Amino acid sequence: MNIFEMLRIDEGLRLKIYKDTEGYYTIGIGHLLTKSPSLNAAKSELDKAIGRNCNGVITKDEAEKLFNQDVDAAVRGILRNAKLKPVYDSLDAVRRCALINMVFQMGETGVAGFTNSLRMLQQKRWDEAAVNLAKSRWYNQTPNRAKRVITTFRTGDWDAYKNL
């Protein structure tokens, strides 16, 4: 398993503009287009992102391209972040994947705020950190996905995704 396959299990693939768990306009493999309530604002961002007149619809090819950009930007964002970089560097390959998924879902900003969990992951206190991560809006709102990520950080292997 790798980061792209993991995220593709978590996010799915939709070739038509859709609403987030949050009600936000998104397309493809979890590509947020706008937090704005107009389908029109969303459509405009879509064509800007793809470089064509999409009319709210994209190809598989286009979805994967956005997904390539998105993953690359998550990693690079982690690397530039003074709070994130040190944890990422301390982690093994699998757990690095679990950090990248949080960042993809919630943004650099959102993850850098899990101060206490970050500290525990750096320390390699896997069980304590899993407990701490679960105490969040994140876990309460998307419990199945949060639990998959959390298991990945606790175990260090891909079993949560084997099922799936």
**Backbone CA torsion sign across 114, 115, 121, 122:** positive
* Catalytic residue of the set 20, 22, 47, 157: 20
Domain ranges of the chain: 1-164
C-alpha angle 77-79-80 in degrees, rounded to nearest 5: 70
What is the token pair recorded at 122? 């750096």
Q: Annotated binding site for substrate, which residues?
A: 32, 104, 117, 132
C-alpha 66/C-alpha 86 separation (Å) is 27
The residues facing 19 across adjacent strands are: 25
- Domain 1-164 belongs to what architecture? Orthogonal Bundle (1.10)
User: Which method resolved this structure?
Assistant: X-ray
Q: Is 20 a catalytic residue?
A: yes
Task: Specify the pairing of strand 14-19 against strand 31-34.
Answer: unpaired
**Per-residue CA distances from 60 to 13, 15, 18, 64, 95 (Å):** 8, 7, 15, 6, 29
Distance between CA atoms of residues 71 and 115, nearest Å? 23
Binding positions are 32, 104, 117, 132
Q: Which of 10, 11, 45, 62 is catalytic?
A: 11
